[PDB]
Amino acid sequence: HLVCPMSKSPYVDPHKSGHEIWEEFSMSFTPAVKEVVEFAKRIPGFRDLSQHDQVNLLKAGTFEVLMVRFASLFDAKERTVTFLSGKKYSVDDLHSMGAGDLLNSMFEFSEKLNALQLSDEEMSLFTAVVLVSADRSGIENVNSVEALQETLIRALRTLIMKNHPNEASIFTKLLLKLPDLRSLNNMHSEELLAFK
Amino acid sequence: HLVCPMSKSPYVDPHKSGHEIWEEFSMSFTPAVKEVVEFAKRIPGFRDLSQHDQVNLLKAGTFEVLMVRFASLFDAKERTVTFLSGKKYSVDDLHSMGAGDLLNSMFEFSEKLNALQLSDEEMSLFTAVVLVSADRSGIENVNSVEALQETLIRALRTLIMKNHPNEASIFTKLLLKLPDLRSLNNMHSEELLAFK
Amino acid sequence: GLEDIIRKALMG
Amino acid sequence: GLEDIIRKALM
Ligand code: HEM
Ligand code: HEM
């Protein structure tokens, strides 16, 4: 099985070679990756990083951007995951197909994120913060990334406190999603590399 | 070579078996692990968690706690690392012995953490926050872990607000250490396993 | 392979 | 490995 909701279905046709399964899968997830790159180009200051650092941030942070953008695929009340086909699959069914604690952790992440009740605008700025906060292990000019991060983080703090003046904790709760996203990325990357 | 500063030295006797090398290394790093566990037992509410969640938080979080506690082994100014013997080693020599981007990332982390100029009590409280913020994927009662983290985080926020100029920015920078630590952990674990 | 998709989309 | 140290220290 292919229990990733980026696929059209978790069912894998056994008559297909491994190379054919992955090419089909790549046709499904590539458009989401390309949308992350276009989003990155619209972040003020992102195009000013060196091209090496731009690619490394996207390499390390694309999954976490998509995790934020696709949090709505996880219906925390019904316990279903919407795959790219639009068809919903239950937690129980995915657990029979081998999905595990990672899936459960994606449910908890999406539940807590949805509960913050962010506007589209704050969600968009949070997503830029998520991208520019990606693992800096490759990065050549860490100071420029750190400066871009602080700029976006400062703007997010101001937007949040402007829009949620008596719920000061929201900003802290948003910052606490970054280690959670990073752990989702660490685990997911393991499962991904095991598949191939 | 063994270029981890939990070792007494980066040098390995080539006549020793991999088994003997590890048992000697384990004698060096085990006191530090046990002190993390003893630190965990002094966190209010920690021992009220299920034993499984206690063990899981410590499995996931011990490295990140130790990274914070031993960040002052990395002297960002002279670019030396202090090994367990007390002897200091240059980044150049350690890179020649096989160190790489991970070491560089730990210097950057240590430099930024030290710039915050936390007091001893703040550093302890941050260390507790790090432990209870560890990867939750193995946790069976995530609500209980979330409530511990919430309690400590607010205690840390009020402490920073009371003691630091530009408190909101110090507190934000402290929380941004959490995903940084998560990445250091992920990379370090891969290096650890590669060494075997 | 992810990196190739990224670089291709980034320069376009 | 790490787990056994932790478990024994927790008692
Ligand atoms: C380029 C992006 C991605 C690629 C190439 C990818 C690929 C994969 C692969 C190959 C697996 C292993 C499938 C299996 O073993 O059955 C997997 C697991 C999974 N992925 Fe993705 N994925 C991507 C992004 C995402 C995103 C954005 C999400 C969520 C919004 C997601 C959710 C999941 C889940 C829930 C699982 C199963 C977790 C479990 O085992 O508990 N993936 N992914
Ligand atoms: C019980 C805890 C730990 C164990 C078992 C452990 C073990 C190891 C091992 C086996 C390696 C690879 C050695 C090599 O390939 O030469 C390594 C790498 C390393 N560890 Fe640890 N370590 C621990 C904790 C820590 C802590 C707390 C720090 C930081 C304060 C640290 C810093 C490093 C560094 C800097 C490297 C080399 C990174 C590079 O290659 O660039 N380790 N560790």
Numbering used by the authors:
A (entry chain B), B (entry chain A): 381 to 576
C (entry chain F): 2261 to 2272
D (entry chain E): 2261 to 2271
Publication passage describing the model:
The REV-ERBs, REV-ERBα (NR1D1) and REV-ERBβ (NR1D2), are closely related NRs with critical roles in mammalian physiology, including maintenance of the circadian rhythm, metabolic processes, and immune function. The iron-centered porphyrin heme has been identified as the endogenous REV-ERB ligand. REV-ERB LBD interacts with NCoR via two ID motifs present within the RID.
Using two fluorescence-independent methods, isothermal titration calorimetry (ITC) and nuclear magnetic resonance (NMR) spectroscopy, we show that heme directly increases REV-ERBβ LBD affinity for one of two ID motif peptides within the NCoR receptor ID (RID). Heme decreased LBD affinity for the ID1 peptide but increased LBD affinity for ID2 peptide, effectively equalizing the ID1 and ID2 peptide affinities. Titration of both peptides into heme-bound LBD revealed a mixture of peak movements in slow and intermediate exchange, consistent with the moderate affinities (~2 μM) of these interactions measured by ITC. To determine the structural basis of this interaction, we solved crystal structures of REV-ERBβ LBD cobound to heme and NCoR ID1 peptide (2.6-Å resolution) or ID2 peptide (2.0-Å resolution) (respectively). The overall root mean square deviation (RMSD) of the complex in the asymmetric unit including LBD, heme, and NCoR ID peptide was 1.1 and 1.3 Å for the ID1- and ID2-bound structures, respectively, suggesting minimal conformational heterogeneity. The overall heme-bound LBD conformations were largely unchanged by peptide binding, with average LBD RMSDs of 1.0 and 1.3 Å for the ID1- and ID2-bound structures, respectively, relative to the published heme-bound LBD structure.
